[PDB]
Structures are given as C-alpha cells and as structure tokens.
Ligand binder design. Structure first.
Ligand SMILES: *[C@@H]1O[C@H](CO)[C@@H](O[C@@H]2O[C@H](CO)[C@@H](O[C@@H]3O[C@H](CO)[C@@H](O)[C@H](O)[C@@H]3O)[C@H](O)[C@H]2NC(C)=O)[C@H](O)[C@H]1NC(C)=O
Ligand SMILES: *[C@@H]1O[C@H](CO)[C@@H](O[C@@H]2O[C@H](CO)[C@@H](O[C@@H]3O[C@H](CO)[C@@H](O)[C@H](O)[C@@H]3O)[C@H](O)[C@H]2NC(C)=O)[C@H](O)[C@H]1NC(C)=O
Ligand SMILES: *[C@@H]1O[C@H](CO)[C@@H](O)[C@H](O)[C@H]1NC(C)=O
Ligand SMILES: *[C@@H]1O[C@H](CO)[C@@H](O)[C@H](O)[C@H]1NC(C)=O
Ligand SMILES: *[C@@H]1O[C@H](CO)[C@@H](O)[C@H](O)[C@H]1NC(C)=O
Ligand SMILES: *[C@@H]1O[C@H](CO)[C@@H](O)[C@H](O)[C@H]1NC(C)=O
Lengths: 598, 194
C-alpha cells in the first residue's frame, strides 16, 4: 500500500484548491474594491492582494512540477497539473524577465497616453480616447479622417516599433523555454487536446481550420465589400476606385476592425424605422434594476437559475453618483465561494439592455461550472465565454422578444426591408471584423515564427491588408512605423484569434439552440426564450468548465466536434442573396495594387 | 422539574469548529424542545428518526447535544449515510440515526470582513470516521511515500484547514451553526422528559 504518483498529486491539488480559493478571493475582492471606488488606498490594496496571489501561484507551480504528468492517468488531474506547471514568464532569467515586463508596461502606457497635437497649436492635443476615436467614428471630411489615422499611427506607432521588436525577441525566448516553437504556437495551445480518442486537437490544426473556414466566408465578405465600396464611392466620389481596396481610414473606426459606423452611409433602406426601444423604456419608467430583472427573467425563462441574493446585494449596476469615481466598463466578476457580481454604469438605453443580457450570460456560465475544481473554472477555450454572451444579446434583440417584453408595439411591421437593414448592420459588425481578425493574427503568427523579417514587417503587413482584407493604406509607411501595435490588443499582448473563433461558435450554438427551440423561419429572428430544452442543451456544456475537451464541449451543444462557418453563412444568407443581386452591376473583389497615393 | 439548559447550547457565545465538535450531556432535567421548535429561524430543522412535535411525550435515557459550525454546502452531510468531506473526516452519523439535526445561518456573528480563520475542518485523514467519533489529532498527514517527522512539507500537510469566513460569501459558503440532538433510550434510567 505505497502511494502512487497520482495519489500524491490528488492530495496536492486538494490542499491547493482551498489555499487557492482563499487567496483568489483576497485578490478579487481587492480588485472589485478598486474598480468600484478608486482610492490610492484601494490601488494599494489591490496591488498587495494581487502580489500575494501571484507569489502563491509561483510557489505552487514550483511545487507541482514534482509530480510528472507522464505518470498520471486521470484527465481531470492531468489537466490541473498541466495548468499548474506552466512556469510561463519564470522560465526566463531574472534580468530578461524584468526587461520583458518593463517593455510590456511601457507599451501599454504609451498606448493609453499617446496624444497627437494639431499642426497649428502645439498645446491643444487629443488622446486616442476620446478624441481621435471620435473623429474616426463620426467625420465625413476625408482630410480630417486621414489626419487622425496617419498621426495616431506616426506619433504612437513610431514609438512602439523598437519596443515591439524586443517584445517579440523576449516572448519568443520564453515560449521556446516553455517548450513551444514560437510565441504564436504558445498562444495557439489554448486549443490543444491530447489523449481523448476522437476529441484530440493539435495546435497547427488551428491554422488549418481558421484558413479553411475563412475560405468559405470569402464569398459573403467579397460581396459585403463590393457593396460597401459602392456606397462609400457614392459618399467620396473622387477618392475611391471601383476596383480598388477600401482606404484604411474610411472604414468607421481607428483601424477598420468594425465597419459598424458605415451603416449611416450604406443603409439599404433609410426611410425604414430602425428599431430602438430606448424610448419605450423611458416611457414605461425602466430603471437599471428593471433591465437586469428582465435579464434574470430571460435566463430563468430557459431553465437557468436566478441571480444569487449575493449578486443583487453586491453588484454595481448604476454609475455610483459623481461623489465617487469608478471604471465604467461592463465586467462579469466571478470572485468565488458563491460570490458573483456584475459591474456596469447602466443607462436606460437599448444598447445597455442588450449588454446586460450579455454580461449576465457570463455570470450564468460562471455559476454553471462553479462546482468544477478551481483550475477548471473557465470557458472550454478562450473563445467560449464571449460567444455565450453574444447569443444572449442575439435572442434579446429580436423583435419577437422585444414585443413579448412590451418594449415593442404588436403594431410594428417587420418586412424584408427592415430585416435587410438589421442583417446589414449585423454584417458590417460581424462579417467585417472577420477578415480583419484572421489577417492581424496571421501577421503576428508569422512575425513570431520568423517568416516575416523586420526589414519587411510593415511591407508584409500592408500586403496582407490589401490581399486578405481588401483594405489599402492611404500613406506609404516605412519601417519606422508599427501600425499593428497601434491597436490596443496588439500593444497589450492579448491573443486576437479568440474573436474569429468566438464569432463562428456563437452561430454554431444559436443554430443548435433554435433547433432545440423548434424555431421556424430565418435563423436571425430566433428568440430562445421560454425553451427549457434549449437552456438544458446549453447548460450541459456550461456546467463543464474547461474539464472536458473543447471539442466535446462543442458537440454537447451542436452535435459536432469542430468549428463550422455554415451557420454563420446561414444566418446571413438573406443578406447574401440581396447583396449578390445588388452587385450585378458592380465589380466584386479587389485589385491589390491601386492606392490613393500612387 | 427545571428546564433543560438549551440556550446554553443554542445561544452560546461561540461554537466549536467541527473537527473538535463538543457535546453536552443533556440529562436529569426536563426539556423545552417544545417551544424552541417554533423559534422559526432554521434553514434546516430535520429530525431523522422521531416525529418533530411529539418528542415531548417520550422520555429518553440520555440526550446528547453536539454543536459545531459548517458551511451550508456541508450541512447536507449532517445526515445518516451521507459521505461528503465532513461526514467521513469530521463528524459522522450512524446509519441507524434516530435524533435531530438543526441548522441556521451565522454569517452575522461567525463571519468577519478579513476572514474568520478560527473555525476549521479536517480535510486529510488515513481513514473514515466511525459514527459519532471525534479526532482532534494535529499529526501531519502522510500523503507521500516518505516519512514526515512533524515535517510540514512535500506530500505532507497539516490536516486542518480553516474556513475563510467572510460576509460577502455566497449562501452555500456562509457559516452555519448546527446542533445534533442524539436521542438515545435504553434500559438506563430515563430522566429527560417534556
Ligand atoms: C480522477 O480522480 C478523481 C478524484 O478521485 C475522480 O473524481 C471522482 O469520480 C468518482 C466517480 O464519478 C466520484 O465517485 C462518487 O462521487 C460523488 C460526488 O457527489 C459521491 O457522492 C459518491 O458516493 C462517490 O464517491 C468521486 O467522488 C470523485 N472524486 C472527487 C474528489 O471528485 C475522477 O473520477 C477520476 N477520473 C477518472 C477518469 O478516473
Ligand atoms: C519549468 O518547468 C519545467 C518542466 O516542468 C521544469 O523542469 C526541470 O527540467 C530540468 C532539466 O531537464 C531538471 O533538472 C535536472 O537536469 C539533469 C541533467 O539534464 C537531469 O538528469 C535531472 O534528473 C533533472 O531533470 C529539473 O529537475 C526540472 N525541474 C522541475 C521542477 O521539473 C523546470 O525546472 C522549470 N523551470 C524553472 C526555471 O523553474
Ligand atoms: C472607498 O474605499 C475606502 C477603503 O476601502 C473606504 O473606507 C470608503 O468608505 C470607500 N467608499 C468611498 C465612497 O470612497
Ligand atoms: C428564484 O426562483 C425561485 C422559483 O421557485 C424562487 O422561489 C426564488 O425566490 C427566486 N429568487 C431568488 C433570489 O432565488
Ligand atoms: C413566455 O411565457 C409567458 C407565459 O405564457 C408569457 O407571458 C411571455 O410573454 C412568454 N415570452 C416569450 C414567448 O418570449
Ligand atoms: C419583399 O417580399 C416579396 C415576397 O413575394 C417580394 O416579392 C419583394 O420583391 C420583396 N421586396 C424586396 C425589396 O426584396
């Protein structure tokens, strides 16, 4: 009766789960108290609590690398031990890891504090938020947009370039020392699965599937592109070529990540009354508590539990007056030991109603897998949480739903037109960002692999914008630039592909849930409310945490083990065939070599 | 013909952490479980083995009152047969249980902002607890294959953990005080009536 390596490792993880829930509750209460009541005092407390938790993770990590996964035959255990044994940034030497952090931080403050001052007043400047961003979202003067674009990229980018070079050097050392080939390979690990016969998935299988699904997206995108270039050309006659790429500074935000603001300029049928129940909500005297109550109701409507008493007592659901200050960004906090909170400065609007359904869907996911051991309390892979949150706002924004909750009047006429209006807005948002996202992350994956030398970093970048995205830079940028790094996620070391995969999952789910709901009609009108078979199908994957392979998790909802664009395509197919009609007289696709400056 | 001290147990200033649960011999006295059943603040008031309102009309040879604290999620285990973590390593009921099990929130008095680490459980033990057993040993657990001579180190853990009790915890992770009234009745002189 001696102890097996696995037995020791179970007891190890047992002691670890309780030490951990306590220290993590320390850190997270500290953080909530900083993000709801910013006092240098509470900055100090957040940092001290985060510090102790970091130091405990490092210490248990070093303790757990003494129980070898090779001698462990229990996937739940093996998962926790592998999660616990990543030494990450510590596998570097101390001097180098200190350097890396100084660089990461320098970039992040350079981004948050980057300011550009106009060529006529050197003291009156704008930071990206809220000045430049505001120009790029609203303006219809070409030269103002161009100035925001070039100057943001030349004041801030040209600073980030050397930092980004060294950041790639060090991250690569770290990922190789963590036994990965390059840093991109490390970010791709999130999707890894060994040893689960028939649910396995290797890291390079992610590049294959991303590219394969993008190939079948390309038709829809090319038509959205052809149509949007048509309408922008009608809005900027002497600047856009009817066979060229779209000028990078005319897309609706500082990068062209979302084409959402181009709706005003590309709305199919303007006269049609767009939907916005903001006005109904004031008129029935809806307050935040109402918003979140209707969200609770929606979730309950599908066999899911209502928020904890803790949730209501402790959440921060309204801006807390101008007598104390807080970070106003919806956050769905899972602090542990039963404590679930939401933080949002709610306004009695439509956007905030849809957002509250989203963030409460986060909380729902957090409660479902709470039973799961601590290192498994998380979405199946990096893409799962935000997808779960998105499908709630989908169900919640439909007219069927808005009517049922009395914010819309049964005497509202949906027609082809308003629904094309809706689907086009949806595509300007969802479909637009897709090639953008695949492209940016392909560029980083190559940078890390070493396939794109620094002497061609921007060259290769803008080739890809033209080839993949169908977007062209309005100024030639030498290597003193670093346009990648001018977007938050890039200069703050966040993996980006999670947005591509989230976008494809969310439809894989909705389609599955609406089939569970016995929905008739086009998929974009479907509201899963009042369908316990749907909540149950969903829940059986929610409850999992990341304790099963993300392939099995997915098959629990949608009956298939891998990503698939077909539900995307199907969601948008009305808009597809209307675009295809509208582009008979038009050139579909783009030549890579036109530009506004040659 | 004088009431059985019950406040002395229920409204006692502090409670025992479950691994060292204490036990008062309620005997040679007359019991007020008659009007305490209506105190009406019990998140779990379940007798496993005798009708609840009529325990008055039967005298027992020796009532034993065990009191301790647990988290709500654990209360489910203070039940015959139930084997969670606590009913096999801290306080186990015999499968032929015949007494009562009473439990109420304590978040107000037993919890504190900053963690009340004064109440503890056992999480590691070589073997399951026999019914109604107590273990207050602080001997280091031998999780490994190597000797731990009061070592507290690799594969060797202090067997006692403390509940990090805090008021902002969820209702399942909130402190609950509990009392288990073991009603025994044998040939021994019965002197606990009502
Ligand atoms: C890997 O090891 C873990 C830890 O032992 C295994 O988890 C254990 O799974 C079994 C079977 O599902 C559980 O048995 C039963 O669990 C319930 C929980 O409410 C209990 O009420 C029953 O009387 C019975 O004990 C066991 O509890 C569970 N242990 C823990 C700590 O969760 C897991 O099954 C192993 N995986 C593989 C693939 O072998
Ligand atoms: C980061 O994690 C890794 C993997 O868990 C840690 O593994 C370490 O690997 C080294 C080198 O193989 C081990 O050192 C010894 O090297 C000799 C000669 O090559 C060998 O024959 C010994 O049997 C032994 O493997 C080291 O023991 C091992 N440590 C652990 C905890 O697994 C690595 O230590 C971690 N890195 C850092 C900087 O903490
Ligand atoms: C903010 O933080 C401090 C410390 O946690 C606290 O004493 C204070 O009451 C809090 N509330 C406000 C409104 O500042
Ligand atoms: C949630 O739903 C149940 C339905 O039976 C109800 O009893 C309960 O009071 C509701 N509210 C909370 C906060 O749990
Ligand atoms: C769900 O059912 C209730 C009761 O029949 C109803 O009042 C509510 O409007 C329904 N919600 C839907 C169909 O979205
Ligand atoms: C609206 O639907 C009818 C259905 O027969 C169709 O004939 C009509 O052309 C549609 N209108 C548009 C603008 O597509």
């Amino acid at each position: 009766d001696p102890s097996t390596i696995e037995e020791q490792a179970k007891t190890f993880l047992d002691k670890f789960n309780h030490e951990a829930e306590d220290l993590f509750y320390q850190s997270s209460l500290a953080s909530w108290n900083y993000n709801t009541n910013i006092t240098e005092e509470n900055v100090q407390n957040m940092n001290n609590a985060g510090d102790k938790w970091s130091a405990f993770l490092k210490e248990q990590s070093t303790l757990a690398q003494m129980y070898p996964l090779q001698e462990i035959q229990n996937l739940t255990v093996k998962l926790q031990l592998q999660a616990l044994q990543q030494n990450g940034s510590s596998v570097l030497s101390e001097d180098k890891s200190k350097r890396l952090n100084t660089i990461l931080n320098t970039m992040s403050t350079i981004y948050s504090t980057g300011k550009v001052c106009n060529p006529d007043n050197p003291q009156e400047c704008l930071l990206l938020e809220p000045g430049l961003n505001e120009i790029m979202a609203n303006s219809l003067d070409y030269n103002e947009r161009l100035w925001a674009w070039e100057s943001w990229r030349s004041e801030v980018g040209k600073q980030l370039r050397p930092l980004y070079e060294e950041y790639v050097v060090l991250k690569n050392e770290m990922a190789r020392a963590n036994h990965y080939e390059d840093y991109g390979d490390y970010w791709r690990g999130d999707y890894e699965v060994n040893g689960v016969d028939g649910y396995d998935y290797s890291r390079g299988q992610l590049i294959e599937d991303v590219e394969h699904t993008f190939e079948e997206i390309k038709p829809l995108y090319e038509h959205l592109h052809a149509y949007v270039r048509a309408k922008l050309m009608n809005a900027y006659p002497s600047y856009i070529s009817p066979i060229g790429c779209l000028p990078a500074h005319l897309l609706g935000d500082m990068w062209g990540r979302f084409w959402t603001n181009l709706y005003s300029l590309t709305v199919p049928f303007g006269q049609k009354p767009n939907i916005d129940v903001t006005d109904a909500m004031v008129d029935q005297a809806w307050d935040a508590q109402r918003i979140f109550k209707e969200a609770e109701k929606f979730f309950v409507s599908v066999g899911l539990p209502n928020m904890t008493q803790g949730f209501w007592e402790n959440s921060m659901l309204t801006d807390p007056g101008n007598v104390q200050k807080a970070v106003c960004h919806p956050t769905a906090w899972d602090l542990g030991k039963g404590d679930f909170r939401i933080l949002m400065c709610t306004k009695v609007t439509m956007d905030d109603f849809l957002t509250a359904h989203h963030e409460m869907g986060h909380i729902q996911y957090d409660m479902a897998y709470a039973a799961q051991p601590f290192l498994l309390r998380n979405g199946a892979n990096e893409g799962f949480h935000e997808a779960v949150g998105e499908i709630m706002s989908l169900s919640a924004a439909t007219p069927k739903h808005l009517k049922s909750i009395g914010l819309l009047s049964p005497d509202f006429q949906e027609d082809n037109e308003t629904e094309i209006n809706f689907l086009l807005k949806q595509a300007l948002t969802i479909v637009g960002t897709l090639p953008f996202t695949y492209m940016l992350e392909k560029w980083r994956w190559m940078v890390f692999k070493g396939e794109i030398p620094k002497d061609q970093w921007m060259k290769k970048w803008w080739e890809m914008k033209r080839e993949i995205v169908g977007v062209v830079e309005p100024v030639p940028h030498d290597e003193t630039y670093c346009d990648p790094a001018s977007l938050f996620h890039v200069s703050n070391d966040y993996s980006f592909i999670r947005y591509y995969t989230r976008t494809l999952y969310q439809f894989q789910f909705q389609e599955a849930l609406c089939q569970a709901a016995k929905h008739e009609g086009p998929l974009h009108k479907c509201d899963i409310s009042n369908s316990t078979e749907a909540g149950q199908k969903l829940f059986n994957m929610l409850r999992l945490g990341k304790s099963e392979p993300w392939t099995l998790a997915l098959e629990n909802v949608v009956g298939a083990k891998n990503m698939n664009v077909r539900p995307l395509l199907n969601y948008f197919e009305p808009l597809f065939t209307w675009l295809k009609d509208q582009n008979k007289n038009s050139f579909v696709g783009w030549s890579t070599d036109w530009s506004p400056y040659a | 013909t004088n009431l059985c001290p019950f406040d002395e147990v229920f409204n006692a200033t502090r409670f025992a952490s479950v691994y060292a649960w204490n036990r008062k011999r309620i005997s040679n006295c007359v019991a007020d479980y008659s009007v305490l059943y209506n105190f009406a603040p019990f998140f779990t008031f379940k007798c496993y083995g005798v009708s609840p309102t009529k325990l008055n009309d039967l005298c027992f040879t020796n009532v034993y009152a065990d009191s301790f604290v647990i988290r709500g999620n654990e209360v489910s285990q203070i039940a015959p047969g139930q084997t969670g973590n606590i009913a096999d390593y801290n306080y186990k009921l015999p499968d032929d249980f015949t007494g009562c099990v009473i439990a109420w929130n304590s978040n107000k008095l037993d919890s504190k902002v900053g963690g009340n680490y004064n109440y503890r459980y056992r999480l590691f033990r070589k073997s399951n607890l026999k019914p109604f057993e107590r273990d207050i040993s602080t001997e280091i657990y031998q999780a490994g294959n190597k000797p731990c001579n009061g070592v507290a180190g690799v594969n060797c853990y202090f067997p006692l953990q403390s509940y990090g009790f805090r008021p902002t915890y969820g209702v399942g992770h909130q402190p609950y005080r509990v009392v288990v009234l073991s009603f025994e009745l044998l040939h021994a002189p019965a002197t606990v009536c009502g």
